[PDB]
Design a protein around this nucleic acid. Structure first.
Lengths: 73, 129, 149, 61, 141
RNA sequence: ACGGUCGAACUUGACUAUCUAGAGGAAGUAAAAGUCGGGUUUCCGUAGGUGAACCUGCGGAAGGAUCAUUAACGG
RNA sequence: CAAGACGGACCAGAGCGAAAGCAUUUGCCAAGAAUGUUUUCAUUAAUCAAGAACGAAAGUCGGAGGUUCGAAGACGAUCAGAUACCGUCGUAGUUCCGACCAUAAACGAUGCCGACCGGCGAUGCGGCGGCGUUAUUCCCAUGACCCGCCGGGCAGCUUCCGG
RNA sequence: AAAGUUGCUGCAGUUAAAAAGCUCGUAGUUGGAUCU
RNA sequence: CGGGGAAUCAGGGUUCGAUUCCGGAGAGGGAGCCUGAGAAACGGCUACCACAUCCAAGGAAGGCAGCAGGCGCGCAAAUUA
């Protein structure tokens, strides 16, 4: 969370390789707009976002609701 | 270190079955090992076994009958769909007459014939013949 | 098999199957708690408290009698130390070895054992930060090592 | 200098002899490195010539 | 031992391709250096102009003289040596003649008794060596 | 016609890369039968001795063919 | 008398160390395995690209010192052709201090962690159980032996487990 | 395709080609029971 | 050029897919346009760059990776019906 009113989230997933019948861990980074109503957001908490029209060159989604990290109160 | 205790249990019982012994002590005991031994017992491959209960992970003493040729575990626990089970039983089993790929589904730990009967797919654990 | 040594030791404790309190022990849970409290006010680590209770008072296992372990009793009352036991011991060992190294520059064995000690310290620090026992911004420093102990 | 040292030599003479031997050794190593690189270059070009002989200008007519 | 996890796919495929590079056939096929050093440039047959006739001595345990022909290829300009197969077929080749040349069969390797020759003559002046040898056709000049 | 925008391309130096003529230098090949003429068991890493081999100094290996003796020791 | 060097015999298939390696006496300093625990924490773990410490000998820089040995080198012997062997002397080096290099047949020519499958009695450390001999019969425990057992090791022997 | 001579299925590393001089260590990979 | 797909193959796999279907790109190289619902179109225009045709020496007209065909290229590929 270092842009003005925009954050970077990551999506982790497993990609299947059929020759070895196995998986590999891959990730993709997404720049999503964060509305100022969601304040006190920490690094490493779950967010659910929804697709929208292009807001900037890279920003395409919009933060819908945030759930806090597992360990923190 | 010790990983996948079912592999240790199956290797121990296979080593003692090859040696011609009558009883095997396997430790530690887990529920999946108990279910695997129950699956082998219902087909009459091993016989009666006792779960010695420590307040730790327990132990098992199994009785051996010479009906077991090879008992084996498949690691890692691959995702076996129902369409792909024929390739698995062509690779691991010695014949179409006998041998068992033990596999765990949401209906429980069962054989490949029971998985065919109940139309469910699961993750592979073993084979014995 | 030790994690920094090639030795494979087997020496450890072996509890019996009986978790019940022995009949000859005429000590209630609150009296054992009060003994733990006064040993803590004297100033001891929980392991030393357990050793004193086993050797002198005949209390074999405190969590079999009281139902709670020593550090949880101290934390619930409020007498547990800030940094944990083994982390403090390892940091103190690192401080002593570092002081020996500033005395003696040519001690290569001391340098290697110091590297092993700091590896243990970093492993324990990572474990305690994962469990939220230590703050995330906590860091061990070579310069700031003796002040914490 | 192939001079056997005696017990009576002191500093500014033994030191000069030692540094003269060190300078001689340094020049000797430079010379040996030059000889090694020259031999490698000449062997490489002669191998190229032998390969050109293998490919063409070999026969009867 | 091999890593037999469930998330170890990229390690296995990276190791497989890195050790694939250590094969001889794969490296000769895929590095793109033997393709550029091949005089034919990955072609079945080439067409050249005869420069000279050469008598190449046979490799030692067999004592004979093989009648080869040194040609210069048209499409790239390389000089190669082609063995004229049958007896008396060398007299059909003349200097400054157009020849169709193919390999021997070992794909870039010197074959049998002839040292340093990868190729053999197929056609001389737009008729084959076999038809001239059997007296089936006449060659122009 | 002024100005602006998009803008092919032109000219000048630098980094290159390619095509293509070359005086000369060093070679080799075919043609001259032309002229003169004993030591080491097998090694490894470094350093020296004319580059390499090889030998030696130092430190390492066996990947080198164990015969004979060995119960008292108290006063 | 002095100078630098080296710690023989005891020294073993014995011990310690991650390895390279480590052998006079005493004192100090900080570590370490193992064993014993009915102590404490409660998964904190295993292998590990990147990265980091150590790393025989030989070698290179700056200082000191040079007893022995000693490559190079100098002579002396020896020969159809000897220019390697041999003998005497001897430079760098071999020694110490502080910087470099990261190489060995750096070997078990055998990755590390964990499980199971025959046997035996010797040894090192620790612990347990003991009739007895010993410290000139020791007044009690304690050290040395003797007999078994358990745990971790350096090894050996035996076996048609199987490869 | 033969090629189980690229091996996930499914190879090898005492002597035939091969295990890093040794240890730590982030990323990666794998991770003991136990809750009808 | 990418897919559908093709060859081989117990099972896994390996290799190819310029090519008649779909989508993309380009009309010798870039660039700018007019008209039109739709083009940065080239069997439309305007340039510069590279080749090139008719010449009366002032000027004009160019774009077959469309169908046949020709040259060249090559080991390699058809009728100006």
């Amino acid at each position: 969370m270092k842009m003005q009113r925009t954050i970077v989230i990551r999506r982790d997933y497993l990609h299947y390789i059929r020759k070895y019948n196995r998986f590999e861990k891959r990730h993709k980074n997404m720049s999503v707009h964060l509305s100022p109503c969601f304040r006190d957001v920490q690094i490493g908490d779950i967010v659910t976002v929804g697709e929208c029209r292009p807001l900037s060159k890279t920003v395409r989604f919009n933060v819908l609701k945030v759930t806090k990290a597992a360990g923190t109160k | 270190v010790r990983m996948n205790v079912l592999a240790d249990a199956l290797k121990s019982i296979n080593n003692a079955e090859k040696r011609g012994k009558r009883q095997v002590l396997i430790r530690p005991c887990s529920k999946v090992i108990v279910r695997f031994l129950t699956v082998m017992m219902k087909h009459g491959y091993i016989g009666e076994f006792e779960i010695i209960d420590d307040h730790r992970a327990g132990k098992i003493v199994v009785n051996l009958t010479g009906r077991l040729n090879k008992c084996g575990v498949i690691s890692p626990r691959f995702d076996v769909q129902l369409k792909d089970l024929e390739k698995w039983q062509n690779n691991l089993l010695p014949s179409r007459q006998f041998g068992f790929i033990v596999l765990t589904t949401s209906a429980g730990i069962m054989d490949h014939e029971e998985a065919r009967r109940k139309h469910t797919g699961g993750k592979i654990l073993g084979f014995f013949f | 098999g030790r994690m920094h040594a090639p030795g494979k030791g087997l020496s450890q404790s072996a509890l019996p199957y009986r978790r019940s309190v022995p009949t000859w022990l005429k000590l209630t849970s609150d009296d054992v708690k009060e003994q733990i409290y006064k040993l803590a006010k004297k100033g001891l680590t929980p392991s030393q408290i357990g050793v004193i209770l086993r050797d002198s008072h005949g209390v074999a296992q405190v969590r079999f009698v009281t139902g709670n372990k020593i550090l949880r009793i101290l934390k619930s009352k409020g007498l547990a130390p800030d940094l944990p036991e083994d982390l403090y011991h390892l940091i103190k060992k690192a401080v002593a070895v570092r002081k020996h190294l500033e005395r003696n520059r040519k001690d290569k064995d001391a340098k290697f054992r110091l590297i092993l000690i700091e590896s243990r310290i970093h492993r324990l620090a990572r474990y305690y930060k994962t469990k939220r026992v230590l703050p995330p911004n906590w860091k061990y420093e070579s310069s700031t090592a003796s002040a914490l102990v | 200098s192939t001079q056997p040292r005696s017990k009576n030599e002191s500093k500014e003479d033994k030191r000069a002899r030692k540094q003269a031997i060190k300078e001689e050794r340094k020049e000797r190593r430079v010379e040996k490195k030059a000889n090694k690189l020259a031999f490698k270059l000449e062997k490489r070009r002669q191998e190229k010539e032998l390969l050109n002989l293998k490919k063409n200008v070999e026969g009867l007519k | 031992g091999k890593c037999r996890g469930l998330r170890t796919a990229r390690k296995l495929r990276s190791h497989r391709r890195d050790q694939k590079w250590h094969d001889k056939q794969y490296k000769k096929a895929h590095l793109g250096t033997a393709l550029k050093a091949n005089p034919f440039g990955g072609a079945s047959h080439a067409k050249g102009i005869v420069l000279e006739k050469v008598g190449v001595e046979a490799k030692q345990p067999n004592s004979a003289i093989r009648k080869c022909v040194r040609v210069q290829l048209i499409k790239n300009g390389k000089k190669i040596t082609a063995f004229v197969p049958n007896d008396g077929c060398l007299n059909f080749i003349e200097e400054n003649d157009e020849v169709l040349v193919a390999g021997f069969g070992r794909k870039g390797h010197a074959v049998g008794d002839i040292p340093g020759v990868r190729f053999k003559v197929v056609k001389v002046a737009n008729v084959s060596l076999l038809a001239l040898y059997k007296g089936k056709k006449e060659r122009p000049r």
